[PDB]
Design a protein around this ligand. Sequence first.
Ligand SMILES: O=C([O-])c1ccc[nH]1
Ligand SMILES: O=C([O-])c1ccc[nH]1
Lengths: 352, 338
Amino acid sequence: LGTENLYFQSMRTNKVIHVIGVHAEGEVGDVIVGGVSPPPGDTLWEQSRFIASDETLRNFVLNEPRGGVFRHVNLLVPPKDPRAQMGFIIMEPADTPPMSGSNSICVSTAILDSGIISMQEPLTHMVLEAPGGVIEVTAECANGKAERINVLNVASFVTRLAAALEVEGLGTLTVDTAYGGDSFVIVDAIGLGFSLKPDEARELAELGMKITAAANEQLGFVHPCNADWNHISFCQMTTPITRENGILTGKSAVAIRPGKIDRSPTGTGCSARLAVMHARGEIGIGETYIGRSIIDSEFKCHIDSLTEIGGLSAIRPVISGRAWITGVSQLMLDPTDPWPSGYQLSDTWPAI
Amino acid sequence: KVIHVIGVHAEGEVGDVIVGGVSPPPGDTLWEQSRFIASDETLRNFVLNEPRGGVFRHVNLLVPPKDPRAQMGFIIMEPADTPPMSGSNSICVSTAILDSGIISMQEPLTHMVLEAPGGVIEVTAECANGKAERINVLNVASFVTRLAAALEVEGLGTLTVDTAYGGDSFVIVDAIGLGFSLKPDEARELAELGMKITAAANEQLGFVHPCNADWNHISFCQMTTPITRENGILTGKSAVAIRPGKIDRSPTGTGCSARLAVMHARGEIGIGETYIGRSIIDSEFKCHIDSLTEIGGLSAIRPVISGRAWITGVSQLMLDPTDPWPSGYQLSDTWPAI
Ligand SMILES: O=C([O-])c1ccc[nH]1
Ligand SMILES: O=C([O-])c1ccc[nH]1
């Protein structure tokens, strides 16, 4: 990657994990490329359950002093599904989910830019496996770089349309719940008094935690084909969709536990929102939808095809965005460091 | 274009060290060079802001020293300031310098002289098996500027505080009866209370260093619990609030220096007597007063701060010219707003 192979003899006793730093439309998605053995498990899903329950890797790479609550880190593993060329496990600050759009884009970009999978130009096609299923990727490549990644995400669908939700201090809200590769409660920000400007980030994150907590209590979440994913991960706070020079476009702020707004438009969020829109006849197959984030970054999306999941109408959405490499690192653990799993403090890692 | 960084923390507090890829800033003193870093902001934003840094990082730039006494210089980049000195960061710098081979390592002890923007510090590193395991730093002259001054703080009435310099500037206040324990899960509350006290101290008391007019504000609020003795050794805990709202994970070497100046002014500790400073996560700096001196008309001390650092990784930071955020960004969810 235009990087030097650095070596320091005084560090020879440290365990070492090789990471490529990346963000997609502003949202960090670092990629572990070396130093970590595939977790135990016959399925990728099972491997991800190990990562979630064991916690050792998660804490090492996500906690200060090496990570920070703004990071996500993805572990590359061999594919289990014969269709796939590479598997990956997504580690978010407080969850290990079935999918993540921005992180899948980071993974695709790191894999191709570093030569882990060979690059064709102008297009590279590959199949990756996430814990929540196989995804098909088309990378637009030029000059040895993967410039834009198009991801055919897993089946997305509505679980509740216009449900009532009681939240302390806010009375009764009307919300949707849906799956886009991860689970969402979706609510209008305008009625909550927000326009989704960047200076609102902390207030939106805290408001989002509260709404997601209420939704998990009152509504829950069921994926008809995944009995293991039974909670709402995210609160997606939206402003209404408009048409700009012919193209449908909408903004949201997605609150990630324990309290951080996605800097990207949230690929799973756009997938979920597209599922609601299609259910209400607000968009059809093929039509472009531009999702925007709190910092005005963008994903270009469309519905690729329709399908069905445990008898629910579903969509296969495409999410497209760009990622950029921010660095390469070797993470080390000195056996005498008194914080081998890092630490968490409420000043920089939101409590609760 | 690639910046080479050794990641380090000293007693929990991050102090990454840039060891290659960045030319020294213009200036005829290290202070002038640090002023360029502070005003230009390009390097600071790139290494401290997300997506590469985070509000919990500090990053140090090695440069050739301007002071003839020194062998290596460094510029400390903290989240909202580029200050004269930082104890934890000087320990990370010393550790990285020796572990990387930038200055040769002798065992069992290496002696070196470094230059921070606030002046020259003398370092003795305890080295074994090719590693610098413990760093002993003779910090810059430290002194009290006000003992037991009144400070009005909204919601708290009137506090009695000290202001002092330990290589950076402090308002020092007793946490007992302020209603928080010095515990990791009170970190956010303490950081916010600290910002508020520092703001009040800057408005009502201010800070002047006799030797340099640019060191003209109070950087930190040091919230203490009373001195005790543990395992026979005088010891005290503090939580230091770093702008824009983070508690030092180390005991704060400049804060220990300032507290020692107060203690000495009050006859609570003599020259050579060990004092252990403790942090919110119970990490430790072993300190003592080495000697006495005078700064302008002020009585002052030369304190030694001792701590251990550990390498967290080695990194190469890069910037893609099409990246829309070449200076990163700051958002209030993870980077506390002013
Ligand atoms: O893009 C996404 O789906 C995502 C989830 C969390 C952060 N980004
Ligand atoms: O050890 C210190 O002096 C320090 C200042 C800021 C963080 N640590």
